[PDB]
Point group: C3
Amino acid sequence: GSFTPSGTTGTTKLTVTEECQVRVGDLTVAKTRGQLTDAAPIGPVTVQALGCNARQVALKADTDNFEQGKFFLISDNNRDKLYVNIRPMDNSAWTTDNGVFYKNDVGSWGGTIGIYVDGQQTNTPPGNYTLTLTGGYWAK
Amino acid sequence: GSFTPSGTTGTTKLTVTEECQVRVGDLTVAKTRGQLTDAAPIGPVTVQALGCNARQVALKADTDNFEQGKFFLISDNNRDKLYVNIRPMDNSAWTTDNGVFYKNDVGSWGGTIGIYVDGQQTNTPPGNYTLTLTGGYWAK
Amino acid sequence: GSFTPSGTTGTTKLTVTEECQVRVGDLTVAKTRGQLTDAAPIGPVTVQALGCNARQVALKADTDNFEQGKFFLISDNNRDKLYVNIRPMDNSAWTTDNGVFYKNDVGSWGGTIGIYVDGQQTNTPPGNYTLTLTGGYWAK
Ligand SMILES: [Cl-]
Ligand SMILES: [Cl-]
Ligand SMILES: [Cl-]
C-alpha cells in the first residue's frame, strides 16, 4: 500500500566527533565514533497520532534516509551514513516498507520511537548526521 | 512609497493534514483541511517597533507570500497556497500595498498580528505552509 | 598545522537595522548601524571541549566568515560583512590561523567566546549577518 502524508516532520540529528570533542554553541546530540557500537541509542522521536482510530499510523523517512529496507542517518555531504534501527518503546508491532514504518494495527497511537545504531560502526567519519521522519497514515 | 527593510524576520508556519493527523517530533501548528474554514485563525505574530516615533511601522511578506493585494502561506513545493488575512488585534488601522502591511500613523507600535484563513479553503493539499514577514518602516 | 573537525557547529546571528527598528516574530540579536562602534559586543558563543586533555581546543569559521586573518559575519546576500574580533572572556591565549582559532595550550577548555565589532562600522547595510563556528582540535 501507499503512505499518505498527513502530519508534521520530525528529525533526529547526531553529530559524530573524535575522542576529543568540542561543543560549540547550543547543545545537541553528539557522539564519538567509539560510542557508535551496536544498539547504541541515538536520539528518540516523539509521536502523537490524532483522529487515527480507523487508520494505521505511519512514519516516512526522507528518500536519503532509507534504502533497501534499512534506515540510516545521512551526513551533510549526502555521502556518509549511520545505519539505525527504528523501534517504539512499547510492545506494539510495526512493519517497514520502502522507508515507511507503519503500525500493524489501527488506533490513535502515541509515544516514543527509539533509534539505535544498527551494528557497530565505530569507523563512521565525524560530521553532522540527520534522519528526517514525516507523520501520516497508511493503506494498501 | 517604498518599504525600508529595518528589523528581524518573523514566520508563520502551518502544517496541513488530513483528518487522521500524525505529529512526529517537535510540536508545531497543524490543521486538518476540514478546519481551514473562513476566518479560521492560524498562528499569530509578535511585533515590537523601537525608536519608530516618527516613522510608520511596516511588515513585508516574502515575494512568494503575496500577489495582487493578497497574502498567502506558500507550500514547501512553492506551488500550493493558503490565502490569509493579516490583522492586528488592536483598533489600529493599516494599509496593504504590494506585500507590505504598514501602519497608517507613526508611533513605536507593538503587539500581535493575527493571521486568519481568507475564505474557506477546505481543499488545500496537506503539506508545510509558511509565511515570512520582515519588520521595517515605510515612506512614499 | 591542520584543524581536525570534531564537534558541533555554533552560530552568531545579528540583524542590523536602521534607527527605527521593527522586531517581527521571535526575538534575536539586533543592532542599529549606529551601535556598530568599535569593540561593541555582538553575541557570545559557548564552548565545551571534552576529552581534550592532550589536544589543543579549536574553532573554525565557515569559509565565508574569514579572510586574510580576519573574521567577519556574512550577510544573507554573501556580500556585506561585519568584521569582528573573537576573544575568550578568560586570561587564556589563542592563535588565529586561516579561519581557525585554537587554544595555545592543551586542556579540556570551556567557557564563553566573545565577539566584538572590529573597528567602527556604522555604515554596514541593514540585513541578517551570520558567523558560523565549528568545534574541533588542532595539530601541526
Ligand atoms: Cl533512544
Ligand atoms: Cl491568531
Ligand atoms: Cl559578548
